[PDB]
Chains A and B, each alone.
Chain A
């Protein structure tokens, strides 16, 4: 459960998919998630008006070659936004940079 949310860049996943992932019925999953908050292994909020768990905090998982690879992408991706923006921002108001 803690692993499945981590690898996803999406930080909310429904219970029903978690039910599949942990191989326990959906009655038992809701309770387990209440306990996950208590421990503080996950933190977030619980909505049963869509049967969702929306996390805001996830424990760092163990370092593996696979996961590193995901890290490398993410910071490459952000790096392109920065680049795009600074050049556009240069042009507009070229003359005033005193």
Chain B
């Protein structure tokens, strides 16, 4: 149940996931049961929040920073450190308004790029209607 949650893009609320598997798998032997590994449960936080962070850039082109702190369930100063980290690694690309009002997920567009998507829309339409017409013809004889 654990493994499939983290793959799927569904929002994963950190202290909720933490709490549920806390009395079972944190106490489960060596991997989390070890003395050094007690600190590998805490580090599990980063891991969770970064998968949601990744999904949400995709989905929200524009989100308020304020809101984003709530969903990931973190301190605001921390979240912002983490936005910077993932942009630095170039995993995501973002534009951060420092007072914390808006965080804008912006991947580079250019003029050519936008027009190239539109050029296809036009052509794809004309092909669809053509195909349909032969299929109108088929049904007339079958009736």
Binding site for B on A (CB under 8 A): 31, 34-35, 37-38, 45-49
Contact = CB atoms under 8 A, between A and B. Distances in A.
Interface of B: 8-11, 55-56, 59-64, 67, 102
25 contacts: A31-B11, A34-B11, A34-B59, A35-B10, A38-B8, A38-B9, A38-B10, A38-B55, A45-B59, A45-B60, A45-B61, A46-B59, A46-B60, A46-B62, A46-B63, A47-B61, A47-B62, A48-B60, A48-B62, A48-B63, A48-B64, A48-B67, A49-B62, A49-B64, A49-B102
Contacts, number: 30
Contacts of A37: 9, 59
Contacts of B63: 46, 48
Contacts of A34: 11, 56, 59
- In the complex, the 8 A-B pairs of residues with the closest C-beta atoms, listed nearest first: A38-B9, A46-B60, A45-B61, A47-B62, A49-B62, A48-B63, A37-B59, A48-B64
Contacts of A31: 11
Nearest to B129: A75
A34 B59 CA distance: 7
Contacts of B64: 48-49
A25 B72 CA distance: 21
A45 B61 CA distance: 6
A42 to B, nearest CB: 11
